[PDB]
């Protein structure tokens, strides 16, 4: 049993026609302190999966050792390692999964909530997550913590049941997660202005945008409130 | 007297150890292999012997990589030569969660050293019936 400290708030994604997005902020928080800048949340698997991470940052640079380790791993005695005999999105997954659920079921976990997006070897999209309670699920769109309550809604606009995806390009999927990383940056007393974003497509493959920021931001109509009721001036 | 060659860790009148002198005789009647040093980077090759036209060619791969920078070839009793890199492996890895940085070659020389060492301490164990050729790149 333990207590997050150094933490990463939101990840967010979804699914389109062709594969998937997945985005975080690149903020280190220390309670209300907004400490660290320069952290990347979105790990990249091999050419295929990216792996987004929020919750306690020691435990996600845990994870990130582990995955490395895999992708060694994988690659001993295996001739077929960059072809037929890579990690996939669903085998980095379960993996994960086990160790979440095992570390919960010692009452030790790794305190994060986990967003694993991919593209299968057949072109099949993947999006799934895991948390610190090793519980499971899958949907059209995924969103940890504060973007479940702020993401997911404007996200399931777009693509509200499996249907939709088929209808949906990269360019309205990139469109409605920046705005989402936007409302998340207004509401979100512990985001950040600057994330990372990372597209997997079964065709033009792994394009992992770095420094990426807000933008487009409204403030104007503040300098018309004034007071708290009655206050004119 | 004699008998001296019937257990592994024994010293003989001479000072020799002869069963690690028998598993010498297992290595030369192996399969050739070797390695050369370049001006940058090394370079491993090995003698694959057809036994039969059933053997599927370029699938009995016996050269191993450990981590990611380091190849390890050897002639002899290959299960042996596995065993060996499974350890190298787990040392490697073992050096790099503590270390952060990845195995020098000379650090993985000795730690396959002292384990391979280790088998001619007891009798007990046998000694590895192989001979390594093994490096890669480092910092220097």
Not at chain 1, 53 to 77: C, F, P, W
Not at chain 1, 168 to 185: C, D, F, G, H, K
Not at chain 2, 63 to 90: A, F, K
Request: charged fraction near 20%.
């Amino acid at each position: 049993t333990q207590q997050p400290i150094v933490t990463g708030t939101s990840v967010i994604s979804m699914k389109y026609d062709n594969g998937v997005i997945i985005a975080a902020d690149n903020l280190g928080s220390y309670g209300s302190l907004l400490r660290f800048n320069g952290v990347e949340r979105l790990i990249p698997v091999g050419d295929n999966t990216v792996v987004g991470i929020s919750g306690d940052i020691s435990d996600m640079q845990h994870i990130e050792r582990l995955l490395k380790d895999l992708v060694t791993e994988n690659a001993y005695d295996n001739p077929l390692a960059d072809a037929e005999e890579a990690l996939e999105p669903s085998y980095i997954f379960e993996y994960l999964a086990t160790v979440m659920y095992q570390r919960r079921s010692k009452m030790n976990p790794l305190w994060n909530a986990i967003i694993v997006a991919g593209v299968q070897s057949n072109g099949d999209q993947f999006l799934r997550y895991v948390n610190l309670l090793g519980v499971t699920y899958s949907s059209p769109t995924l969103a940890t913590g504060f973007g479940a309550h702020m993401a997911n809604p404007l996200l399931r606009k777009v693509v509200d049941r499996e249907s939709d995806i088929p209808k949906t390009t990269v360019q309205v999927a990139e469109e409605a997660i920046v705005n989402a990383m936007r409302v998340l940056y207004y509401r979100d007393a512990r985001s950040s202005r600057n994330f990372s974003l990372a597209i997997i497509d079964k065709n033009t493959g792994l394009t992992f945008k770095k420094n990426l920021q807000v933008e487009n931001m409204k403030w104007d109509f503040a300098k018309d409130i004034k007071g708290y009721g009655t206050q004119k001036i | 007297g004699t008998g001296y060659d019937l257990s592994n860790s024994v010293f003989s009148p001479d000072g020799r150890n002869f069963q690690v002198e028998y598993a010498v005789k297992a290595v030369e009647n192996g399969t050739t292999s070797i390695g050369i040093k370049c001006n940058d980077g090394v370079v491993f090759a090995v003698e694959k012997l057809i036994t039969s036209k059933l053997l599927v060619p370029q699938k009995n791969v016996k050269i191993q990589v450990v981590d990611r920078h380091i190849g390890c070839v050897y002639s002899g009793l290959i299960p042996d030569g596995r065993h060996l890199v499974n350890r190298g492996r787990e040392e490697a890895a073992s050096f790099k969660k503590l270390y952060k940085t990845p195995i020098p070659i000379p650090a993985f020389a000795d730690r396959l050293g002292q384990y391979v060492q280790a088998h001619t301490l007891y009798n007990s164990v046998r000694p590895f019936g192989v001979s390594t050729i093994f490096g890669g790149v480092d910092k220097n």
